[PDB]
Amino acid sequence: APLAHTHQDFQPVLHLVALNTPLSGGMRGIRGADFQCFQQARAVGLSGTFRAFLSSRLQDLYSIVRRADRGSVPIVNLKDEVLSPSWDSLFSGSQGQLQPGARIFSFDGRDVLRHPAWPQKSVWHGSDPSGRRLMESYCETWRTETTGATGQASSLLSGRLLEQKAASCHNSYIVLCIENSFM
Ligand SMILES: [Zn+2]
Ligand SMILES: [Zn+2]
User: Fold this and answer.
1) What is the Cα 141 distance to its own chain's centre?
2) Which CATH number belongs to the domain containing residue 164 in this structure?
3) Which ligand is nearest to the CA of 9?
4) Is 125 annotated as a binding residue?
5) Which ligand places an atom closest to the C-alpha of 77?
6) Does residue 57 contact residue 141 with C-beta atoms inside 8 Å?
């Protein structure tokens, strides 16, 4: 079964972990995506609060992490490898540029880029490079997988989380979960 991640606490960090399955724009709303993050996190023994890395109605992706934890707290993957020095650095205009060589793991320990369970190496986000929501491009608040509606997404092969591609909601992409505060 999935092995648990037991974080040796030292200094505050926030984990960025991918869901175990890709999802389409029809996620049953943000409530739907957040619940899967919460469930999969607990399954590997994490105690923090995980929320989907997505913008929603009246909610900018940028304000997902608690104010106090935004400017300094390092972002690390499941294996506690650093992806970013802080939350704010992703919204610096770098388009969420990750550390060269970095890798994103699912809650169950798989490298999303290397594993075939994720056919499409793209991440949904519904936001601009500032982390502001795109009301015209977030699959109607992640409630539809119809070909006609779009959701802003990013190619992971690029190394950046916030690239600006408007993709058809009828697509199976990677969805990330971010620990919203350190405790
Ligand atoms: Zn096992
Ligand atoms: Zn850890």
Assistant:
1) 15
2) 3.10.100.10
3) 2
4) no
5) 2
6) yes
